[PDB]
């Protein structure tokens, strides 16, 4: 083991998965139901902010 494995994990992360877009502006829906969606990685969002989904619904 080594402490420099961060670069190794970072490299595998960018290529291993076709995901992880700009988290600070984008997010992923963990679950949807009962008129509620569990968005993921939607950091920097403000309380009451207006977000938009894929289909255009806000």
């Amino acid at each position: 083991l080594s402490t420099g494995e961060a670069s190794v994990v970072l490299a595998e992360k960018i290529k291993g998965i076709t995901q992880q877009n700009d988290i600070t502006e984008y997010g992923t829906v963990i679950s949807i139901g009962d008129g509620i969606a569990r968005v993921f990685g939607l950091t920097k969002v403000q309380a009451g902010e207006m977000v938009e989904f894929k289909s255009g619904i806000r």
């Binding site: 083991l1 994990v9 595998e12 992360k13 291993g16 998965i17 995901q19 993921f40």
Partner: peptide, 20 residues
Amino acid sequence: FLNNVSLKRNQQRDIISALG
């Protein structure tokens, strides 16, 4: 990576193996 929950099981396994 660990805090990420929307990641798939198969994807997590590949990243863990890359670590060591």
